[PDB]
Write a protein that binds this DNA or RNA. Structure first.
Ligand SMILES: [Mg+2]
Lengths: 49, 38, 1321, 537
RNA sequence: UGGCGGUAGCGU
DNA sequence: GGAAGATCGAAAAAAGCACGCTACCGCCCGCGTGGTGGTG
DNA sequence: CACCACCACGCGGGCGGTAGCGTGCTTTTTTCGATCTTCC
């Protein structure tokens, strides 16, 4: 009832709670509109680093 | 006990007593009647 | 009129005064007619399977080489009977066989030449069949598919009464709802611009659809606006003067013509000037140039010299633009006639807002709105636009939909196409524009003429059509695989989609509800129920207030009182008594045509829409028997409103006083003396009464009990007239008359009554005969009485001697005091049957078996069990006793079925179902052999009748030929056939008769063999189970405190005390009353119909008492005849007439012995007995007219200070028993996740301490109590164990510990990317 | 952890759905596929698609349907994600933390207990035995009738004779909390002392029903058993019914007679003018009670009796004063249950509902709490007994209909005909004529109600020793309306007079009212019109 | 040895 | 004297929709491929 | 003995289709393109 497990993700995935729950935490932190955020997360546009 | 469904040119005095006025400024007209400019 | 055989046994006195002109129709006709329309063969493809096949077939392959077409369909006979389906648990259905033609054309010549034509018959699933009672047998269970009240397809205009824009402006909108397709909406924005939406998506300007319809701007302006020609004269740019264009405007320009100054500048226009210009017929008017600047051009104007456009269409004009147009030589200019209140410029403003300017742009925009993200292509956009509304495969405006569409648009044509067109959309938008302008009105959404009723047949046809189009797609895919020359049509199609859709509709639908088998009234009400909560309809939460209201159009179609009390109030309604359905699905009600004042007898069925035009009179209107109203001012209703009208202005007459109410409401006597709310409660609780072990007729009724009893299939009704050849407690054999004889038939009808079979509500269904040997019967006469039925009359409750008085607070608020004689006489005792199933399946290790012995149990446990491991029939059992002994290998573990705790009763039936191949035990062999014996007995009786006839013929032939009757009578019967006479035609006919006898015997033994094979055919089960054993336990529930009892007027209550017989109040004669009721309920709950009924009941009982006395003194038949005739003749202008002089002096005695328990009284729901009639009946019975007698206290013996109301009332025992509600738990099982106690009574579980109780505890100083509720009793396992141990040892101390639910929540939150912990510091 | 998402067996060879397990399986599948693709040195498009699908699966597991379409399971509905088991009404917070199912609880229908005291409630024997099982085990082991607790259950479920005595011992002073399903306010749950009864229904004191908002027509109540010393202490001291006398919302009393006590007290405290035994002088209330029981004097006889009343002085004790008062036999009988401190003016009246409430309030203010509880119990007992003795009943002749009502109705018809003729003449518009019709119909209804009330209240014209006298009527309907036991002026007026104007659902008033009483026969139109308001309400 | 969904009903 | 700031109206998205209880049924992959066992 | 029939089964996911599906509630927050404004 108390022992937990874990899965090692092959690639990082964004947390939906910190992305889609308005106001978006990731978008507010990065000062970028949410549309760019989830068009970059889901492999539709490139973002410069 | 509540409900939800959505369904004067003069002042009448019923008791006996004096009349007081609050935050009033007025002026006496030609006939002497008081008209309030507030 | 001569009474029927069952009616002559007990004639009910009728106090109705207005003669009836239309008999009550069949109650269950709405379901049966719809199903017949669904299944009956139709030469024209309009309804049912034929219509669906014609809509889908023919089927064309991908290439024009092969095709499949439908010819005819035939429904085969069901394999199992309805009773057999119910017993075996299989679905009552019939096979569907369809004739299909596969046509293979010529590959070389595809112009139409054919190569092969193949005919075949193929099976494509089983269609469930509706029984004679309008119900379905799905998986062995009775189901009812209720009708759905939905929105009729068509175009509907409405608006919001200032709900939006915060300014109070009305935004008109119009919706085109099809039967199958997409929804098109046209809305008005706050800025007075028309917009169009498809399927409630993002709006677009309303000119986009017009542009996509190959309409240019000039055509749109011509269609939606009036044209004014600004013809360029020598000067002043005169127009054509149309006076209708000068209504209510500002005349800023000087109106002069023919040298007369009609209107000067700055003068407004009223009716006088309009009259003046109309009379002057002015056509040419001088106009200022600036007046042109305020207009809008209509069509494009181009320059001929330069080949360029001077002006486009639909923009505001300007001085420079008009100067350029004038200098270009265009002496003719066109403009729009626009008014600020009469003809608004909505279309022009929408076009200006509209960005598109061509058909292709509009199509691309429509495609982008419909499918965002996809690349807009010309072909894709064109295909989508064509398939949206102009394709029969995607859009279907039904025949009723087309009729409503044309009616809303004022069109004389009804037989239109099922798809939309340019004209339809243009007319709809024009009507919306006119409504916005002011000419026109919005439609009533809740109007019953705008609401359709869909029955079981329509929904079944729709589901079959869905399955059929799925099968059509599959067969279209399959047909293009080549090599069609060696393939029959049988393998082309697949029955999986059709069968799956049919099963889903009939078993897993919101309207295929479990049949309510509490009583015949419950079944009748359920079958005649209309629910707006089905698919494609309303929802219980977002229903609203307006829809639940009682619309005026509900008069005569929907019962205003019979509706559930709760969340689904108004959404579920009951059909009226005389209400029926149109061919389009609209409800209609009967009326009597009134011509020239006199009321005729011809019946016209008027719908909701057409009833508004006529003025409909009232049933409660006095007539002089000549058809003329005695009063000039008759109360009528013209258009949803009541008013007084002249006697010569009436158009129609109400057909009956029961037209408004439903059957449940019409079953309530003295309804007009009860409040509407109380009537609603009484109607709702009338169908919750469980049947008692003895049916008691209502002393006071309404006369509708016979119809309810007969129409419901709970009673056995003779199919053909004749005499009762053999009556028995379980079967009836009727020898039919020679008139109703069939050729080649013995002529005997066998009715096997159902005895003690559990209902859907775990009640008892039992039929008892009401006929004797040699008693003649006729068609329609009842032979057996079903549950809650007495002599063919509905009997839901019992007649009870009640007294209205307070009794020491034992009837304080609503409680009921019940005498011990009620329990002693078992008046309200009921029988409840519960079914328990033991399932022997196949496991991975091995198959479990039903066996006698059980590991680790004593010998006394198996005493009830037989050698086969099944409990003996008739063996009394209690909680925890073994019913079916079953073990499962692990050597084996216990899995035997046991009686649930707190459940007792007697085993009355055991049914064993065995899968094919699995061996049958001794009990199964016994059950099948009893069934075989019963079938053999029936067929044997048939054989004896037929062979007796044949042997009588043989004896007649022999006595005609050899006249050896003396020798024949002394010889065995077979020797008559074995003997041979002299050689003539007599020998030939003897041989023919012997051959006929032999072939008849062969046919009957073949029938017996077929019946035996059907009995032991072997039913299949679920995959994995090899045996099922069902055990039925019957228990008797007696009345006890806490049980809910109610009358027919909503006076519900709970039994508070079973008073001793000697303690109950008694009258002068010493007879105690049975029920004591609180008078305090009457003044608040305004239901006077109680007291009146009580009074009437007393009178009825008094009459019976007198008759009983006349029977106890062995008086002559003349006195009984005279007294009963006097009793029946009592009244004032009563339609019922009873003549006892034609009763043959023997039926009078039977009638008297039937009435000795109280003469029944029929009180029509709105034409009942007045107070004077009740007082006269009381005087006939030698009872006080006031209805109040002097009572004495049972205990002290002192007379009560005031007379009390003592009478007889019909009491009903509702299906809310205290033993089914009482529950208590100290410690039991807990949930495996939250570690909390389970919920419910079937499983041992505790009550829920909800949030509101926690708030209540917090409002107190309850802190330790709250912690105790939260932790030590629910979640903390260690706390629970410690508390239990401490109480066991005698210490009342607690350890709150840590609730497990919080730990579960913490783990659940930690499962996300969020860390949460309980810090210590 | 797996135990929080268990795979329960279906007892048929298969298992449950476990949407969490399905989402985890999908996530694992996506992760493994992505790992295999990375190990294979995949081109950009394939790894991009796999990563996007894995991200979508992770989002669905964390919050199904948050961004895109929800993953559909085998039931053709969205699967339950991790966020779905935390939020909402069905989430953990509102279903297993703020409220939960509790042991030592039961539920049963309610029944009036007239013999019960204010602090007592009737509990079924079987329910009490089930609820108090551990206490019975403990008492049995303490007294030594069993050797092991298994033997304790074996004596319990077989229902031995001593088990009833043990159960009676363990419930002697163990309060039980009774709660109704809608717990609207604090008084929705109250503590009572259990009294073992035969049956399956819980017996409830009538006087607490108003606190519970409970009526005896099928309502059910839940009983909880405190099982710690602290909880019993707060049940006795905080949640006890005797403690709750005033509503916390406004301070008004919550225990008032409602239906039969009021009627009984009203009938007892009433006077005729020629009743049996009128005019005699009695030595005290006991003599009046003896005369009433012996039948020598009527309950309404106006007599003169000697009574002693105790008044509270400044020092706080009671000083007695004996005097002869002109009263009735019933009032003298009722005086015997009034405590000493209260004066005699409380019972020397008709004693309606308001009078009883005022008398109880004065008793509470002057005497205290325990005397107030005793007085309330005695008032309820006496009211029930004398309501039973009165034998009041409702009959069809009680609702007397005056002919002046018919004359007024005919005059109203004449006036409405005149108004309609004036409208036909064109001198009055539709709105004003409709308003005038409504006004005249309201006036006619008021006149009918006034005439009916005047007939009802003083119909009794009875003869005194010499001549006639018009006194207050004894009509049962009128007594019920006047005493306040049940009904008001409007309901009695609907019963006997015209039902008045009725409103169609949109809110407007129909021109023609219901001019038929409930005693008389409403036609189809009147019933159909009334159904509009009934359905609206 | 549980969950989900639908249906109907009871008390408010 | 034309692009940031402010406004702003419409479109979309998210959150909520009383409590307690009773009874019933329907369902709790999939599918359609391939490995492997039976076979003419 | 390589060919058909039975059960593992594997990854697969929205399904079935030569496309859409959706259609009777109210309140709050975001946001996003369009519009007017004003000064650097
Ligand atoms: Mg109640």
């Amino acid at each position: 009832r108390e022992r937990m497990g874990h899965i090692e993700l092959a690639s990082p995935t964004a947390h939906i709670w910190f992305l889609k729950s308005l106001p978006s935490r990731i978008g507010l932190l990065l000062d970028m509109p949410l549309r760019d955020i989830e068009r970059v997360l889901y492999f539709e546009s490139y973002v410069v680093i | 006990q509540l409900t939800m469904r959505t369904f004067e040119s003069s002042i009448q005095v019923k008791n006996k007593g004096s009349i007081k006025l609050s935050n009033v400024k007025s002026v006496v007209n030609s006939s002497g009647k008081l008209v309030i400019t507030s | 009129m001569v009474y029927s055989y069952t009616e002559k046994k007990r004639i009910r006195k009728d106090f109705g005064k207005r003669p009836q002109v239309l008999d009550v129709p069949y109650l269950l006709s709405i379901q049966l007619d719809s199903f017949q329309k669904f299944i009956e063969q139709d030469p024209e493809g309009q309804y049912g399977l034929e219509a669906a096949f014609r809509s889908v077939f023919p089927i064309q392959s991908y290439s024009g080489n092969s095709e499949l077409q439908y010819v005819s369909y035939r429904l085969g006979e069901p394999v199992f009977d309805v009773q057999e389906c119910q017993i075996r648990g299989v679905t009552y259905s019939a096979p569907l066989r369809v004739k299909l033609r596969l046509v293979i054309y010529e590959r070389e010549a595809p112009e139409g030449t054919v190569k092969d034509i193949k005919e075949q018959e193929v099976y494509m699933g089983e269609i469930p069949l509706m029984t004679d009672n309008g119900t379905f047998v799905i998986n062995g269970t009775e189901r009812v598919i209720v009708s759905q009240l939905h929105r009729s397809p068509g175009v509907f205009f409405d608006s919001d009464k200032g709900k939006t824009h915060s300014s109070g402006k009305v935004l008109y909108n119009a919706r085109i709802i099809p039967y199958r397709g997409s929804w098109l909406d046209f809305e008005f924005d706050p800025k007075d611009n028309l917009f169009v939406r498809i399927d409630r998506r993002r709006k677009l300007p309303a000119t986009i659809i017009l542009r996509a319809l190959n309409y240019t701007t000039e055509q749109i302006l011509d269609l939606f606006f009036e044209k004014v020609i600004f013809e360029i004269r020598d000067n002043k740019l005169q127009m054509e003067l149309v006076p209708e264009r000068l209504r209510g405007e500002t005349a800023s320009f000087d109106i002069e013509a023919n040298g007369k100054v009609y209107v000067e500048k700055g003068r407004r226009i009223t009716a006088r000037h309009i009259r003046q210009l109309e009379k002057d017929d002015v056509k040419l008017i001088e106009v200022p140039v600036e007046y042109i600047a305020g207009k809008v051009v209509a069509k494009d104007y181009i320059d001929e010299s330069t080949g360029e456009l001077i002006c486009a269409a639909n923009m505001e004009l300007s001085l420079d633009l008009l100067a350029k147009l004038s200098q270009s030589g265009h002496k003719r200019i066109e403009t729009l006639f626009t008014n600020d209140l009469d003809h608004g410029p909505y279309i022009s403003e929408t076009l200006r807002v509209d960005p598109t300017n061509d058909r292709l742009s509009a199509l691309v925009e429509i495609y982008r709105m419909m499918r965002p993200g996809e690349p807009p292509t010309r072909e894709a956009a064109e295909s989508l636009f064509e398939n949206l509304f102009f394709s029969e495969d995607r859009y279907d405006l039904s025949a009723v939909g087309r009729m409503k569409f044309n009616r809303s648009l004022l069109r004389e044509e009804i037989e239109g196409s099922g798809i939309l067109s340019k004209d339809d959309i243009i007319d709809v938008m024009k009507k919306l524009i006119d409504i916005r302008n002011g000419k026109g009105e919005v439609d009533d959404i809740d109007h019953l003429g705008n609401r359709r009723i869909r029955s079981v047949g329509e929904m079944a046809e729709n589901q079959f059509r869905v399955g059929l189009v799925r099968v059509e797609r599959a067969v279209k895919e399959r047909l293009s695989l080549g090599d069609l020359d060696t393939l029959m049509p049988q393998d082309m199609i697949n029955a999986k989609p059709i069968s799956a859709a049919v099963k889903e509709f009939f078993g897993s639908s919101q309207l295929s509800q479990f049949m309510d088998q509490n009583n015949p009234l419950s079944e009748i009400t359920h079958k005649r129920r209309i629910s707006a909560l089905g698919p494609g309809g309303l929802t219980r939460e977002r229903a609203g207030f307006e829809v639940r209201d009682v619309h005026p159009t509900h008069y005569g179609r929907v019962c205003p009182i019979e509706t559930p009390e709760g969340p689904n109030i108004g959404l579920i309604n009951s059909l009226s008594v005389y209400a029926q359905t149109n061919e389009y699905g609209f409800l209609e009600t009967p009326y009597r045509k009134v011509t020239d004042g006199v009321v005729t007898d011809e019946i016209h069925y008027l719908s909701a829409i057409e009833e508004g035009n006529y003025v409909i009179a009232q049933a409660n209107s006095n007539l002089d028997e000549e058809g003329h109203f005695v009063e000039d001012l008759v109360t009528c209703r013209s258009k949803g409103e009541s008013s007084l009208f002249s006697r010569d202005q009436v158009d129609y007459m109400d057909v009956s006083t029961q037209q408004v109410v439903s059957v449940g409401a019409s079953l309530i006597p003295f309804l007009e003396h009860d409040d509407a709310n109380r009537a609603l409660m009484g109607a709702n609780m009338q169908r919750q009464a469980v049947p008692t072990l003895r049916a008691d007729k209502p002393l006071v009724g309404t006369g509708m009990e016979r119809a309810v009893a007969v129409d419901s299939g709970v009673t056995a009704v003779a199919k053909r007239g004749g005499v009762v050849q053999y009556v028995d407690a379980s079967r009836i054999v009727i020898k039919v008359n020679e008139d109703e004889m069939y050729p080649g038939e013995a002529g005997i009808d066998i009715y096997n009554l159902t005895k003690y079979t559990r209902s859907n509500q775990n009640t008892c269904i039992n039929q008892m005969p009401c006929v004797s040997l040699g008693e003649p019967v006729e068609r329609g006469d009842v032979l057996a009485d079903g549950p809650s039925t007495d002599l063919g009359e509905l009997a839901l409750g019992q007649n009870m001697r009640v007294a209205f008085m307070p009794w020491n607070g034992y009837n304080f608020e609503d409680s009921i005091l019940v005498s011990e004689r009620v329990v002693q006489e078992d008046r309200f005792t009921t029988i409840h049957i519960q079914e328990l199933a033991c399932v022997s399946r196949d496991t991975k290790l091995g198959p479990e078996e039903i066996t006698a012995d059980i590991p680790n149990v004593g010998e006394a446990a198996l005493s009830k069990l037989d050698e086969s491991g099944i409990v003996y029939i008739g063996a009394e059992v209690t909680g925890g006793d073994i019913l079916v002994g079953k073990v499962t290998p692990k050597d084996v573990k216990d899995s035997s079925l046991r009686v649930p705790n707190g459940v007792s009763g007697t085993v009355i039936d055991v049914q064993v179902f065995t899968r094919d191949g699995v061996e049958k035990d001794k009990r199964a062999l016994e059950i099948e052999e009893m069934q075989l014996k019963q079938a053999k007995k029936d067929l044997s009786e048939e054989l004896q009748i037929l062979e007796a006839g044949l042997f009588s013929r043989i004896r007649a032939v022999l006595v005609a030929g050899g006249v050896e009757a003396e020798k024949l009578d002394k010889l065995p019967r077979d020797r008559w056939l074995e003997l041979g006479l002299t050689d003539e035609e007599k020998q030939n006919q003897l041989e023919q008769l012997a051959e006929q006898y032999d072939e008849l015997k062969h046919e009957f033994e073949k029938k017996l063999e077929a019946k035996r094979r059907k009995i032991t055919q072997g039913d299949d089960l679920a995959p994995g189970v090899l045996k099922i054993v069902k055990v039925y336990l019957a228990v008797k529930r007696r009345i006890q405190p806490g049980d809910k009892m109610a009358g027919r007027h909503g006076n519900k209550g709970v039994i508070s005390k079973i008073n001793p017989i000697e303690d109950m109040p008694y009258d002068e004669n010493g007879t105690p009353v049975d029920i004591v009721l609180n008078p305090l309920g009457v003044p608040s709950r305004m239901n006077i119909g109680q007291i009146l009924e009580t009074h009437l009941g007393m009178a009825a009982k008094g009459i019976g008492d007198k008759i009983n006395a006349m029977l106890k003194q062995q008086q002559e038949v003349a006195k009984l005849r005279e007294f009963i005739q006097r009793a029946y003749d009592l009244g004032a202008d009563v339609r019922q007439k009873v003549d006892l002089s034609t009763f043959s002096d023997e039926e009078v005695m039977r009638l008297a012995e039937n009435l000795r328990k109280g003469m029944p009284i029929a009180t029509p729901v709105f034409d009942g007995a007045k107070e004077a009639e009740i007082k006269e009946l009381l005087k006939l019975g030698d009872l006080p007219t006031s209805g109040q007698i002097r009572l004495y206290d049972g205990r002290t013996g002192e007379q009560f200070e005031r007379p009390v109301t003592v009478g007889y009332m019909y009491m009903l025992k509702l299906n809310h028993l205290v033993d089914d509600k009482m529950h208590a738990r100290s410690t039991g099982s807990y949930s495996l996740v939250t570690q909390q106690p389970l919920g419910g009574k079937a499983q041992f579980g505790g009550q829920r301490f909800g949030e509101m109780e926690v708030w209540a505890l917090e409002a107190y100083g309850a802190a330790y109590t709250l912690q105790e509720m939260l932790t030590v009793k629910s979640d903390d396992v260690n706390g629970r164990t410690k508390m239990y141990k401490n109480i066991v040892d005698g210490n009342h101390q607690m350890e709150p510990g840590m609730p497990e639910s919080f730990n579960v929540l913490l783990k659940e939150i930690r499962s996300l990317g969020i860390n949460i912990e309980l810090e210590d510091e | 952890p797996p135990d929080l998402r268990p795979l329960v067996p279906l007892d048929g060879g298969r298992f449950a759905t476990s949407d969490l397990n399905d989402l985890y399986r999908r996530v694992i599948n996506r992760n493994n596929r992505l790992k295999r693709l990375l190990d294979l040195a995949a081109p950009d498009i394939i790894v991009r698609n796999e990563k996007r699908m894995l991200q979508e699966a992770v989002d669905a597991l964390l919050d199904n349907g948050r961004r895109g379409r929800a993953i559909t399971g085998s039931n053709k509905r969205p699967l339950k994600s991790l966020a779905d088991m935390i939020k909402g009404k069905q989430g953990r917070f509102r279903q297993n933390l703020l409220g939960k199912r509790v042991d030592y609880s039961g539920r049963s229908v309610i029944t009036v207990g007239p013999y019960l005291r204010l602090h007592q409630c009737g509990l079924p024997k079987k329910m009490a035995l089930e609820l108090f099982k551990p206490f019975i085990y403990g008492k049995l082991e303490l007294r030594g009738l069993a050797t092991t607790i298994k033997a304790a259950k074996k004596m319990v479920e077989r229902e031995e004779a001593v088990v009833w005595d043990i159960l009676d011992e363990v419930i002697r002073e163990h309060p039980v909390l009774l709660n109704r399903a809608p717990t609207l306010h604090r008084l929705g749950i109250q503590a009572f002392e259990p009294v073992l009864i035969e049956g399956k229904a819980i017996q409830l004191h009538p006087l607490v029903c108003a606190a519970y908002n409970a009526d005896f027509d099928g309502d059910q109540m839940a009983v909880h058993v405190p099982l710690t010393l602290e909880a019993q202490l707060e049940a006795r001291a905080l949640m006890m019914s005797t403690n709750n006398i005033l509503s916390p919302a406004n301070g008004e009393p919550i225990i008032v007679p409602s239906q039969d006590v009021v009627l009984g007290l009203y009938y007892m405290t009433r006077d005729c003018v020629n009743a049996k035994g009128e005019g005699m002088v009695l030595t005290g209330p006991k003599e009046a009670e003896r005369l009433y029981r012996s039948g020598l004097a009527s309950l309404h006889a106006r007599v003169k009796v000697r009574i002693t009343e105790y008044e509270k002085d400044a020092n706080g004790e009671l000083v007695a004063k004996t005097s002869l008062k002109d009263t009735t036999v019933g009032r003298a009988i009722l005086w015997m249950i009034v405590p000493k401190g209260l004066p005699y003016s409380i019972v020397n009246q008709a004693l309606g509902k308001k009078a009883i409430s005022k008398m109880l309030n004065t008793c509470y203010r002057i005497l205290g709490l325990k005397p107030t509880v005793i007085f309330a119990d005695q008032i309820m007992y006496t009211g029930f007994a004398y309501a039973a003795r009165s034998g009041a009943s409702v009959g069809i002749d009680d609702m007397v209909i005056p002919e002046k009502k018919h004359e007024i109705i005919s005059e109203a018809e004449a006036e409405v005909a005149e108004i309609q003729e004036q409208f036909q003449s064109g001198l009055v518009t539709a709105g004003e004529r409709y308003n005038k019709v409504i006004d005249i119909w309201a006036a006619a209804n008021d006149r009918v109600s006034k005439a009916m009330m005047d007939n009802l209240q003083t119909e009794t014209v009875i003869n005194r020793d010499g001549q006639e006298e018009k006194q207050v009527s004894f009509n049962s309907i009128y007594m019920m309306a006047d005493s306040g036991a049940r009904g008001s002026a409007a309901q009695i007026r609907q019963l006997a007079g015209m039902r008045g104007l009725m409103a169609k659902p949109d809110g407007s008033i129909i021109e023609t009212p219901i001019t038929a009483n409930f005693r008389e026969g409403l036609n189809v139109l009147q019933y159909f019109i009334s159904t509009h308001g009934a359905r609206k309400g």
